[PDB]
């Protein structure tokens, strides 16, 4: 939560392993801070994460952690949460996870409204396997498998999850951790499927061939791409080319959680049939 981060960490694991300036330790810090701010106890928190470079996050925290196969974090988490419907489950995965190979699971988790806390670590390529193309890489960028310019198009995870039926959607980045923690603390207290789109930076594998090889050049580019929600909401469609609004984008309050309704099916299952 503060200068004492070691209550929530497997301190024998740190120093971490990412590169030197990846925007992944910032998200871990923010998660720990917002867990403390809410008064949660680490004997109630589980953290399941897919395989990739955001999958190392489930190694450093001191709780009941799981590391799953590629694209299946949300299904394991659904099972864990359904069998223990009183504890706090958090999912962490990349953009080549649950939006490329596991987009089906994410869409159906949004649809059926399971009380999860999906957190997407968006760095716009596949980092672990050395810079392949993602469903979120912008057009024209050099990737290892598109060496004349990427021509596939892009996903908008927020619009897609909104169309699927998520109850709490929000976007932030590692360029403002206080707002990141405010969004996380408002989304953790929600009682449906909460989706957080977090823009991270991959300067080693993405920006290195697009001339953003330093961390700060990538950070300034990412800042230029991001505008607030009302900034964006006022500009003209002439002007919203490659602009992303940040903040809370949807907080449906008249909704029903999945387990809260299966409990009703359970009660009328043999409440005298």
């Amino acid at each position: 939560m503060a200068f004492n981060y070691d209550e929530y960490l497997r301190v024998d694991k740190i120093p971490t392993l990412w590169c030197w300036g990846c925007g992944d330790g910032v998200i871990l810090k923010s998660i720990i801070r917002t867990i403390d701010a809410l008064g949660w106890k680490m004997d109630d928190v589980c953290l399941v994460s897919g395989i990739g470079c955001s999958g190392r996050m489930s190694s450093y925290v001191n709780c009941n952690t799981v590391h799953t196969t590629h694209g299946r974090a949300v299904a394991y988490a659904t099972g864990i949460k359904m069998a223990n419907p009183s504890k706090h489950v958090i999912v962490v995965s990349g953009d080549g996870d649950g939006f490329a190979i596991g987009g089906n699971h994410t869409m159906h988790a949004c649809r059926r409204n399971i009380d999860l806390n999906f957190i997407l670590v968006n760095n716009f390529i596949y980092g672990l396997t050395n810079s392949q193309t993602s469903p979120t890489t912008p057009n024209g960028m050099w990737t290892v498998t598109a060496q004349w310019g990427n021509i596939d198009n892009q996903f908008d995870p927020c619009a897609l999850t909104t169309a699927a039926g998520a109850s709490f959607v929000a976007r932030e980045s590692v360029l403002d951790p206080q707002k990141l923690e405010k969004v996380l603390k408002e989304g953790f207290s929600h009682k449906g499927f909460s989706f957080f789109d977090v823009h991270s930076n991959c300067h080693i594998n993405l920006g290195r061939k697009n001339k953003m090889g330093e961390a700060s050049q990538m950070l300034k580019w990412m800042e230029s791409r991001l505008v607030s929600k009302r900034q964006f909401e006022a500009m003209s469609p002439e002007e919203r080319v490659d602009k992303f609004p940040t903040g809370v984008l949807r907080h449906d309050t008249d909704r029903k959680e999945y387990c809260e309704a299966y409990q009703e099916i359970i009660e009328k299952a043999q409440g005298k049939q």
Partner: peptide, 14 residues
């Protein structure tokens, strides 16, 4: 500085 550090290395007093 303490919020923007990825490797838990810079600390500020209370």
């Amino acid at each position: 500085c303490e919020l923007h550090c990825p490797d838990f290395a810079i600390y500020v007093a209370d």
